[PDB]
């Protein structure tokens, strides 16, 4: 092993963590930011008024991106344990 | 030496049975510390020295008729040492809630296989009702309740009656109220302090309680438990006298009521 | 009869099944259940498993199985010894109470599964169930009873805890952490009603109705 | 090591060999000029033990008899009586050390 | 029926008990001086009934430790 | 055959390698892994693992194991007393309905990998497959079985922990410790829908299909 | 040559010192390490310990070394059979395929540890090093590479939990804990990959290549 | 070919197994009164057989001591 | 003695995590050695009153024991707890005791035992206290910090082991035990 | 001289004191302690003690021990070997590089204590030490600087345990368990320093300084 | 092995600490105090809307730091490691 | 130079093997009809062979304890 | 000065072994022809020497079973 | 009063030693030559003393024995 290689493993790792949560962060961040928007104009609130819209976001995307999320999740493994015998050296 | 002696060997068995239970039951007695071979001859090296001016005459049946004779024996060790745990019981619950005021078993709120709290303040404050159990006569009243059991109820075709298992276990009982009555001066003044810091939010709802609220409460804690420590000293007299009265009871309530 | 072989085998073989099999065939699940669920509510441990809520559990079910441990000595250890039983009527004799005592508190279903699923054929009544299908079904019945009971438990805790939470929310503490404010109230119901008695009771009164 | 067996060893050898060297004594007690033989039981084992793996010395006769035969049963008898009883020793004392080793071990 | 572990065993153990209980009452009988019976009769049963004990004294052990290793690893 | 010699010593060793090669070989994984799972829901252990779990798997897997020990009693222990079969065709014998057993739960693939590992030549039907193969493949199944089963345990939970969670933000629970509050609701959920009888249910009749 | 004594001195000692030198000296120790760590991933034990992943390591081990066996067996055993062999030359024989096969698995730099700080002498090939050498540096290597792989095995299961907690975190979870959601997802990712086979596999294929 | 370590031990209990017949049978003739068979050949049979067997107990014990000590590994 | 050393030991190893001294050999070989070190005066005094005397002349067996046993129970009482005499003669029913000598063997020993239990349980748990010093310390600090649930065991650990090395831990440990043994 | 009367009866007692006092005289305590110490850190077990520790513990006090074993051959062994030495010369010939040896790791203030407590007279130099105080006193110095190496090996894990609770909860990760995060990056930080050759050359230098 | 020597080497663990955890924690903050600034004027808040911003910075943290914070780690541990013996006496 | 008790333990293997191998020849020497060789040498050399091998097997005995003593610990 | 439970076993052992070769030089006497040395004599000290071994063994059991005994249990 | 089984047992080693110190203070006398004392009366008695010390061999086995198994049960 050399810290090039764990270097690399681990910037891979952090990529398909990153698409793996894209969509979720995205439509969160997107949702809150919508009601923020919204919370002056009518500066009315209680702490957030934006709880249900992010739940029902996540809901959406998790429902539509699916698919291809977890199929990346699913060959990103596989493919690390197929290769993880030529790793060793 | 011959059985002539040695089923009157048949004397030093059923004492030599009891003393042991309750050596391997009770609080200081039985501790991991201790070798075996430790308890096991200090059990039977005080029966030697009980066991004549015991009058004793029973039969090891084989396939035994007579092990519910043995069942009585080791059950009168289970009730006067396990009993006496009580007193340790409720001052592991006492520490132990005083650290669930002050901040440091919030692992232990929201979850885990890990509690980690059980080291902090619980083995602080049963370990010094160890010594102050120790200090007395704390590990020697046990054994002479057990010779009054000896003497009071020695070995009988009526070992144990019902309606006395519930003094026992509806006991403790005592482990929650006393383990109250002890933290409660320190429960309190937390409860003032947490409720004055959460009045802080009122001016400014930034206040933050993991901010600003656990250092003030541990360093309250640590000081106070400080300033409450003798407290302990008076309390475990109580702690342990009337858990004694109670196995006395018992031990004395059982020969009127066979 | 047997013969001073075997006799001494099946003595300290059942002696060596005594702490699993005899203690959870009795009582002992319920009550131990029921304690640890007991003990989540309220917070942390606080009371020492292997040094007192284990000994309470061994010390109630004594109490519990005061009645059919005397059925059972009058019906054995009085004939058995030295005449006329002889360890094989003393054996059915001495499985009856026990048996009648478990009988009692499985649920009527329970039975129907481990039936269903051991190829039994019709059981005639309630005394020809072998302790084959009598021993799981009674677990699974005792596992519900102890769920049951530690959901009971968890209710008034729980009320405690929403409570305690809503009035410090709502009088403007934004942010506190409501749990360890609840803690000591949740000692004090416990202790002010003398909540230990009630429980102990209620769960004796419970066990066999 | 092991060579604490060897004196009695070599003496119980030389004592078989001289119960050899005195049953054909016996066997010759008559034919014609003989000149019995014998051998220095304490001389050999001796010399056995300084170097390891026997010069068979004449008996000096007693009784002329004409047939040049000096085999004198009598003495004969005696001497093989002796080495009997000697070679029985010998395997007690050796039967005794193999014994101690044996038992100082298991 | 069924296989009957319940009922195999204790007709196993049944069958150790009544060699057992044989032997006995050959010895009985050849001891209290009743015709018949011969010596080595007599000490070749009692040693077959020993070796069935000891058969049954093993299986046993295997038993036991087999069930304490079972009931002991944390689920 | 064998001379009373090799037959009580293959016996006792058998008897010694049971408790871990024939319990892992036959059932009891999947049962006890599963259980472990449940554990893992529902909050804390709250259920003895050393006791009560443990007996109740082991009376599970006697009562699936019965048609199996059945087949296996008639083809050696009736034929194996005393006539035409002594322990060499006795193993074979009782092998077989076993090993058609464990080749109906293991995995299409891992017979696959295991026999690839081995260099075996080309195998022409089930029957071809040797216990050395037929081992690791049916413990390997066997583990991908009771990881799925604890899948399909874990989603109520998940849902009702979710829920609460959701529900308590909405309110404003701040922060609300929402696990303690969703415990009792989880042991509620698992004894209305009748979860222990409909579990072991479930998984019995998961087993055989 | 040996004569029926220490010949049978030497084998019931050798069976002696089989359970650690011999499993210890060959495979087993990556492989159980390897369990053990992905065994900590996916949370809970899940599998018994002294009962599954010991007997399927061994059997896996087995497996690989069935070559290696193969030629200890046909260069020692087959000879060994009253001719031209008896354990002098056997046991360089015998070693000689388990050499090749530690050396070609051993670090090319453990060695010069173990040898150094023996005051070896300069070494002229791989078949100059001795057992001696060879044994301390196959366990320090074969425990490096048991660790890579367990590193390996963390990197997915650290992936879900992190992704996990950051999707709780954006939407508002302040105090939910994420393990537990986060479990099912472990072994979800460990059971769609088919992660038995591939990590069972993918030990034996690294441990040749 | 293979190892087969079962295919081994199966081979060597046989074997252990036939040689303890062929000392039986050799009980068998000597005692029935036959020609040949000599009550050296018988003792020094039956005690080859006795060896052997011993043998086969010693290998037994040590793999099952080796066994529960290699299963009674902490994972 | 070596039963006092020895909780002690078992004791100290309770604390300061996790065992890592190998029991069977090292702290029962030092108990050993530092017993033996306490006792050589006392095996000193049996030896030179039964054993050369026992040798051959005037002593055989007989006067041997009492000789050998007067050094051994003045060492005993020495180290008595005062109260737990008093108890196993008032459960002997035997009479009142007019010296420090008048106390038998067979009230001797029971006595010894629990005072030995009593002391080395006192000292353990003295031992104790400092480590679950470092336990709250630690604990504290982690969760004034706000490092949520840091698993304080694991970070106390090497605060342990420095806390007992740097204080010099296990000579001064075994000289105030050997100090003790005989004040 | 003795005369296979107490030879013979010293060397077996000699082997059965062998395991505990003189594999603790010489080393084997540093070595296991340190490593049961790097075991605490890195995380579980993950390690098999009884199996790979031990043995690499036994090839390593070996290897540092190699000196002294080959001093004492030397001067004792060969020379015992029929001629001018038996087994009263043979012991200080023997005992003197141990003595030198153990000498040279003692700290220089454990031999005043014991030899304080042991009455012992003024010593004139370090070969005035008897065996009787130099044993204890080793065994204390063992320890002290067995617990010295553990605290140096405990520190770089507690750096990552610490900084990777700090990234986690600053992030606002407020409870993500850091020991499941950081486990795996304790051992990759193990892993890529190469932590085994390091760790145990170390130890084998220091045991000679 | 006075207290002057553990003190120095738990100074050099501390500084070493904040050097492998500077760049992440120090960006952590920056972001917190930018979105902060941002988050009056236009005094729109819901709760956070910087978590997912603090998540992509300690991304873009450890792509660069990367390397060199895994080197000078494994600098002090292998100095650590390697000074071992010496240390004792 | 150099121990490598492995050395030691083979060279002691090898001068049972041998002395085992000396008496076995001179009992087939003596029984076999040679000169020489006597029945007192003969003996003695096999006792001498049994007493060797004894140890041989006592000193295992002890080998293997100290080891699984050893193994037996935890690190 | 002391016990010196050392110095006591390295007496007890010398005078076993100085028994055992004062026995063993009288047969060495007796046996080489010195007149002097009887066969009474030599029988009764060979038979004192293997009495006073045999202490010597049991004392060393009775030893070995004591140090066994602390060894082995916890701490 | 009291028996105090430890002194039961001193009573019985005494008997046993006071017979044997018999047995042999009467072989003293006889072969002594002094008058009276007949040779079939001193083997006699010898073989009585044997028979007795015997008697307390067996004593000390089994008592060594029950006491190493009552050192056994677990407390």
Redesign the interface.
Known sequence: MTPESVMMMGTEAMKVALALAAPLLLVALITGLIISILQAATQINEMTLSFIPKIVAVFIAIIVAGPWMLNLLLDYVRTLFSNLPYIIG | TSEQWLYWLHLYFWPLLRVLALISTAPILSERAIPKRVKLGLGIMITLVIAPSLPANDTPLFSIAALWLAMQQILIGIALGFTMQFAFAAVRTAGEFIGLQMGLSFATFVDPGSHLNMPVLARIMDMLAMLLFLTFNGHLWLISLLVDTFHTLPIGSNPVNSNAFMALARAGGLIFLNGLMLALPVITLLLTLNLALGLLNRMAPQLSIFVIGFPLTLTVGIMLMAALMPLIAPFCEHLFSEIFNLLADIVSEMPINN | ??????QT??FI?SL??LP?ILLMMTSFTRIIIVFGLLRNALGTPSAPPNQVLLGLALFLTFFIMSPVIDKIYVDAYQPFSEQKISMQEALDKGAQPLRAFMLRQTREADLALFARLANSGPLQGPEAVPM?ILLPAYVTSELKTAFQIGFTIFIPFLIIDLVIASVLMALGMMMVPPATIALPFKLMLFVLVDGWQLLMGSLAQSFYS | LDAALRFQQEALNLRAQRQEILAANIANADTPGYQARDIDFASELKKVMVRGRVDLLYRVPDQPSLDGNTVDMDRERTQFADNSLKYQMGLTVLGSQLKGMMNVLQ | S??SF?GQLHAA??R???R??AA?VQAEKFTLGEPGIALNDVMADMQK?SVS?Q??????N??????????????
Chains 1, 11 share one sequence.
């Open positions: 009869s047997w013969s001073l072989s075997v085998l099946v073989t060596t099944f699993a084959r | 069924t296989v319940a153990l049944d150790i008990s009544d057992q209980a006995r009934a004990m058969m049954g004294i093993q299986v046993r295997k038993l036991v430790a087999a069930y304490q290793e079972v009931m002991s690893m944390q689920v």
